[PDB]
Design a protein around this nucleic acid. Structure first.
Ligand SMILES: [Zn+2]
Lengths: 89, 118, 121, 278, 195, 73, 147, 73, 124
DNA sequence: ACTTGTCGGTGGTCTGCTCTAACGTCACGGCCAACCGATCGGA
């Protein structure tokens, strides 16, 4: 005699299918850390939309934080003038 | 001289075992067993004693289920059961697989025998 | 709080049962609550509480051979509760000391009781 | 630095004009791409030209767990960060900001990736501070300082110091040689404590048989109640309410049955056989 | 070794994601290659990776090789239970098929049999009482011992085992000392002397 | 705990305490007479190593006579 | 597993990436072994219970399931299967390298097998695989012969 | 002596710039911390303190400092 | 189950423990705390139960699990729980006979009854 | 009336991430030391 259980099917991004045995009275997660190490969603038409994570700090964000738009525009104008003079004389 | 029998006599029936390979420890201070080395194996092979050598290797050193089954059979008075598979062989197979070597045991049909009994 | 009084009553009832050898039913039904009808209902609830695990040998035990209620297993509950700071002890001491009756137990009863209670607190 | 900033701004403007923008002239697109490529090349050139300060900084951290090349690579990451955060308007040379960031990166990495059992940085700092204070106390007093002096000079309790010292232990290796020759190892003297004793198992089996024989001297009701209550049936015990619901009786009745059965079992004729098993 | 491999792999992932110049990426890839090589076989290429005390680390190949390796030390020869060891003296009154075993050594060897036999003779009520009696060396244990060792051969061995006759079976007899009594005529087979 | 052990403890009344016995016992095949005990305690300002609170050493002396198996020269 | 008399052969061979990731029950991602405070295995480390198995018998990592009745199920919170603790010496992991790495046995051997297979001297292999020299993987000879 | 020899072979400790130097001299031993019986009873080490006079010289400014440094037991 | 059963079980468990039991173990081990819907209802209920026990007079101490453990648990000091020894018996009879005769304030009569009951639980 | 679950808050500790602007720029601490036979890569 064993406790009744269900089997959930998960699919990774690169076409991998895995089976996970869960209990009956349990909230089956939409996404799971599969055996390959890649996160995979559960095969369901009614997707339980998970959280969305925004990208972290990048070089452009730091540059814009430490420099105003006017200074960068002036520097770009000077560089464009230099390359124009070098190219077309 | 400082060589007295009181410091030399040692005997054991069952005691502590090792961790990686489930074999008995060594030394009087640890209630360890006596080593049955390769030369003794050669002597047993020359004698022709297959069963004594098999039981010495399997059910006195490494057969984890076999040790407890043998003790129970001796206590209750039944026959000694058949030996199993030594744990050292499974340790060797895992160590070979960790070196990117595909070691697999094949049955008579040609399939692969899983070592995950339990 | 009408639950706190019951809880204190039980916490004192168990040591009382363990400290009076084979107390009859009538004495308990007259001393700790006049209503003897609820005494059985309180014993039934005491029979259900015990040590973690709540297996036999962990819950508190008893012998209802007849009227005598003896405890065989107490689950650590052997001593009564401590008289709370001020509150009950304060009121009892104040009543014992501010008596306006000429001394009748003064020689070796009232003063001895006052001193012993003060030392105990 | 100016080339890097110009390239970054040109890339951002090109990205903005790509989506919800306008048809850039061909020469403008060519110039933007050229500026972006020049900025990338300038960043790479600055990084490569400054990949010599990292080695000098990491030279001083050799012999403290991590390897020399790992320290160099962590310093290279710190140098990348310093290049990302360098401002040319202040007029200071690159060798100061770069030094700060390289040292920070090397120290943080050596705090993380140097112990088999990882300790957080906020506690590695405390351990280092305690060690420095201990060295100063040893120099001042002339003797080995006791935990009391460290407690006073580190404004902490005289008990946290013991925990800090006990968190600094590094595990030894099971493969280290014990004897003079090469036949002994530390791992051969370690006893497995989770192995079956081979004598407790048969004793447990005999205890189960004896207990079954003893419990077979009662009626069906008491034996079933005891087996369900103590979990002797398959693997786990139940509660008073569950057993009462299964048997359709009140919990007080179940408690009375259990009390009577336990009283009966305490009789010597039912406990003399089981005395030696406890 | 696994930690080194994982650390270098993660650092390589970070360097590739950032977009570092090819020199740093190439150096990291070379370090990852060296770490994997040290994991599989530490010392074949370059210098060995050492720990505290300048002791080179032990890899998988070091596990599988040598006299102290897996095969020779743990598969072709093992340590066994039900075995003892003691000094040998000369017993000239023994027969060629007999040996003198100490009572304590024989008791320890035959404990599983003695427990059962003294439970059967109602000397102990159960196995635990019999084990306690054996541990305390009760007077009624020794008689039981003389019943269990009768016609039960034991193998005697003296290292080095140069030929078959280095292991020989004997019928044991309890002796009061702590030294094994060996027949004088089996010494040449064992190459044994009583010094 | 095992259900059988719990039932036995309930029968005999021996409450299960969350402590494991690790007493110092005489090794196998050894005996003698106790001749000395040395006790060190941290609460008495003894330079014990870190983590160790108490330490105790016992000396056992035995007179051995000559017997079969002893080596003379 | 059982009946040693049923073992007919013991075959050995090279293991590809597919076999390596079919043996494994998960990928280890952190160089962590145990927690310095609770002395408990970390997650995705070298001793992770989600990959290799439970340290206790019939107990998961978060302690939600602690009974033999929960046999063969996986805890929905910690992801640890509820089984015996002896599976920790039977389950392997794998590490996904960010760059291919040659096997030391088949390169630094006498004789070198990669060198024999590719007709390359061992010094050339050591220069190539340790990032000291470039090697032309392929060349479009048809295009060169036309322009 | 051996200590004098090693200190003399290490006495000039100068940096690359040549502006600073550190010197060690005059090794001296104080009285023993404890007797042999006390060391064996209490599990200590039979050692004595070592003091070496260290002198710091700054070549550019010419200011010199000298302190008695404790080198250990 | 019942609130009184939860309180009694909690009192017994905290009396019989040897080390500071954390609240997480209290939830799983002590009966009656395992029927909560979520971790916040249990937390608030346990806080209220602790408040009630502390107000009653039962010594409920909160402290670390141990030196090398950062978890924080609760215990009950069995030595501070009460005072066993009692004095003579003749004076206590007079004290009880005069414990309450005409007082009507509910707090006073409840306090006197509690003191009398504790005295009976500590001998007469 | 008492309890109880959802809501909201204060204060504290453990853990992780980011930043610091004179100038600073290409590693060491150290053997190895037998002695035989076999064999692949050079010359
Ligand atoms: Zn879990």
């Amino acid at each position: 005699d064993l406790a009744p259980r269900q089997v959930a099917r998960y699919r990774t991004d690169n076409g991998e299918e895995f089976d996970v045995p869960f209990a009956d009275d349990a909230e089956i997660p939409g996404t799971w850390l599969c055996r390959n190490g890649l996160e995979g969603t559960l095969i369901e038409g009614d997707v339980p939309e998970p959280k969305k994570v925004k990208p972290p700090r990048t070089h452009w964000d730091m540059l814009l934080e430490r420099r105003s738009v006017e200074e960068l525009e002036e520097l770009l104008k000077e560089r464009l003038d230099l390359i124009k003079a070098k190219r077309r004389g | 001289l400082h060589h007295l029998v009181d410091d030399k006599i040692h005997a054991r029936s069952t005691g502590p075992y090792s961790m990686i390979t489930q074999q008995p420890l060594g030394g009087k201070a640890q209630f360890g067993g006596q080593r049955f080395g390769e030369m003794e194996c050669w002597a047993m092979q020359a004698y022709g004693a297959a069963y004594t050598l098999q039981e010495l290797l399997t059910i006195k050193s490494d057969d984890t289920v076999g040790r407890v089954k043998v003790y129970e059979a001796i206590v209750k008075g039944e026959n000694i059961p058949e030996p199993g598979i030594p744990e050292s062989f499974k340790v060797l197979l895992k160590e070979l697989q960790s070196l990117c070597l595909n070691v697999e045991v094949l049955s008579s049909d040609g399939a692969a025998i899983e070592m995950r009994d339990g | 709080s009408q639950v706190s009084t019951r809880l204190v009553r039980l916490l004192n009832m168990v040591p009382y049962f363990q400290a009076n050898p084979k107390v009859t039913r009538a004495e308990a039904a007259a001393a700790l609550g006049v209503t003897g009808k609820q005494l059985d209902a309180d014993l039934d609830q005491l029979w259900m509480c015990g040590l973690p695990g709540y297996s036999p040998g962990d819950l508190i035990d008893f012998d209802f051979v007849g009227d005598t209620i003896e405890v065989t297993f107490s689950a650590g509950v052997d001593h009564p509760l401590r008289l709370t700071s001020t509150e009950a002890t304060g009121i009892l001491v104040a009543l014992r000391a501010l008596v306006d009756v000429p001394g009748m137990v003064d020689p070796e009863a009232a003063r001895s009781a006052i001193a012993k209670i003060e030392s105990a607190v | 630095a100016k080339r890097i900033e110009a390239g970054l701004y040109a890339t951002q403007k090109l990205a903005e004009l790509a989506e919800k923008g306008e048809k850039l002239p061909v020469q403008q697109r060519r110039d933007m791409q050229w500026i972006c490529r020049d900025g990338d090349r300038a960043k790479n050139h600055l990084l490569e030209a400054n990949l010599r300060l990292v080695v000098s900084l990491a030279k001083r951290y050799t012999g403290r767990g991590m390897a020399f090349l790992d320290l160099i690579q962590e310093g290279n990451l710190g140098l990348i960060r310093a290049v990302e955060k360098f401002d040319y308007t202040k007029g200071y040379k690159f060798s100061t900001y770069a030094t700060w960031w390289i040292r920070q990166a090397i120290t943080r990495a050596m705090a993380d990736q140097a112990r088999t059992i990882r300790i957080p940085v906020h506690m590695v700092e405390v351990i280092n501070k305690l060690g420095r204070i201990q060295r100063e106390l040893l120099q001042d007093l002339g003797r080995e300082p006791t935990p009391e002096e460290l407690a006073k000079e580190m404004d902490i309790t005289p008990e946290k110091v013991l925990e800090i010292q006990q968190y600094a232990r590094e595990p030894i290796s099971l493969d280290q040689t014990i004897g003079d020759e090469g036949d002994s190892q530390l791992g051969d003297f370690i006893e497995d404590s989770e192995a079956v004793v081979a004598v407790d198992a048969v004793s447990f089996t005999l205890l189960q048989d004896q207990l079954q024989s003893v419990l077979e001297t009662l009626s069906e009701r008491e034996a079933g109640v005891v087996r369900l209550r103590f979990g002797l049936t398959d693997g786990q015990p139940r509660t008073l309410d569950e057993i009462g619901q299964v048997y359709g009786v009140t919990r007080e009745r179940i408690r009375q049955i259990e009390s009577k059965t336990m009283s009966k079992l305490r009789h010597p004729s039912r406990s003399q056989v089981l005395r030696d098993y406890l | 070794l696994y930690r080194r491999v994982i650390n270098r792999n993660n650092r390589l992932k970070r360097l590739i994601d950032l977009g570092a110049p090819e020199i740093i990426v190439n150096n990291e890839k070379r370090m990852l290659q060296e770490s994997v090589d040290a994991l599989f076989d530490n010392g074949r290429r370059g210098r060995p990776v050492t720990g505290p005390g300048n002791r080179p680390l032990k890899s998988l190949s070091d596990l599988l090789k040598g006299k102290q390796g897996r095969f020779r030390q743990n598969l072709l020869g093992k340590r066994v239970d039900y075995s003892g060891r003691s000094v040998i003296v000369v017993g000239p009154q023994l027969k060629l098929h007999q040996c003198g075993l100490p009572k304590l050594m024989a008791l320890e060897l035959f404990k599983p049999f003695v427990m059962k036999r003294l439970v059967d003779l109602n000397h102990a009520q159960n196995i635990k009482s019999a084990k306690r009696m054996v541990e305390r060396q009760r007077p009624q244990v020794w008689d039981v011992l003389e019943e269990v060792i009768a016609e039960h051969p034991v193998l005697l061995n003296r290292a080095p085992t140069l030929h078959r006759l280095g292991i020989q079976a004997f019928e044991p007899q309890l002796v009061e000392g702590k030294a094994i009594q060996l027949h004088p005529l089996v010494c040449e087979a064992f190459n044994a002397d009583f010094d | 705990l095992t259900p059988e052990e719990r039932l036995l403890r309930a029968i005999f009344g021996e409450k299960a305490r969350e402590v494991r016995d690790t007493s110092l016992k005489v090794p196998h095949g050894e005996s003698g007479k106790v001749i000395g005990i040395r006790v060190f305690s941290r609460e008495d300002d003894d330079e014990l190593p870190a983590g160790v609170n108490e330490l105790v050493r016992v000396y056992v002396a035995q007179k051995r006579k000559i017997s079969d198996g002893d080596k003379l020269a | 597993m059982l009946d040693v008399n049923f073992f007919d052969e013991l075959r050995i061979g090279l293991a590809t990436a597919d076999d390596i990731r079919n043996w494994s029950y998960g990928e280890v991602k952190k160089p962590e072994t145990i927690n310095y405070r609770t002395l408990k295995p970390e997650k995705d480390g070298l001793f992770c219970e989600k990959i290799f198995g439970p340290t206790r018998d019939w107990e998961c990592y978060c302690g939600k399931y602690k009974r033999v009745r929960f046999k063969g199920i996986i805890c929905e919170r910690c992801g640890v299967e509820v089984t015996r603790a002896k599976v920790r010496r039977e389950r392997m992991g794998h590490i996904e390298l960010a760059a291919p790495v040659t096997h030391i046995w088949y390169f630094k051997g006498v004789p070198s097998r990669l060198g024999y297979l590719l007709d390359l001297a061992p010094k050339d292999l050591e220069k190539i695989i340790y990032f000291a020299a470039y090697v032309i993987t392929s060349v479009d000879d048809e295009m060169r012969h036309n322009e | 002596g051996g200590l004098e020899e090693v200190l003399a072979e290490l006495s000039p400790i100068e940096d690359f710039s040549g502006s600073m130097s550190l010197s060690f001299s005059d090794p001296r031993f104080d009285e023993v911390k404890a007797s042999v019986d006390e060391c064996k009873d209490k599990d200590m080490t039979y050692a004595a303190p070592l003091f070496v006079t260290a002198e710091f010289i700054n070549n550019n400014t010419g200011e010199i400092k000298s302190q008695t440094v404790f080198m250990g037991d | 189950v019942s609130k009184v059963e939860r309180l009694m079980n909690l009192v017994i468990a905290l009396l019989s423990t040897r080390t500071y039991l954390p609240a997480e173990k209290i939830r799983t081990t002590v009966a009656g705390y395992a029927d909560s819907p979520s971790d916040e209802a249990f937390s608030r209920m346990f806080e209220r139960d602790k408040n009630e026990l502390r107000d009653l007079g039962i010594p409920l101490e909160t402290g670390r699990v141990s030196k090398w453990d950062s978890t924080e648990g609760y215990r009950i000091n069995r030595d501070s729980y009460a005072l066993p020894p009692i004095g003579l018996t003749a004076d206590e009879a007079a004290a009880v006979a005069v414990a309450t005769q005409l007082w009507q304030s509910p707090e006073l009569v409840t306090a006197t009854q509690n003191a009398v009951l504790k005295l009976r639980a500590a001998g007469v």
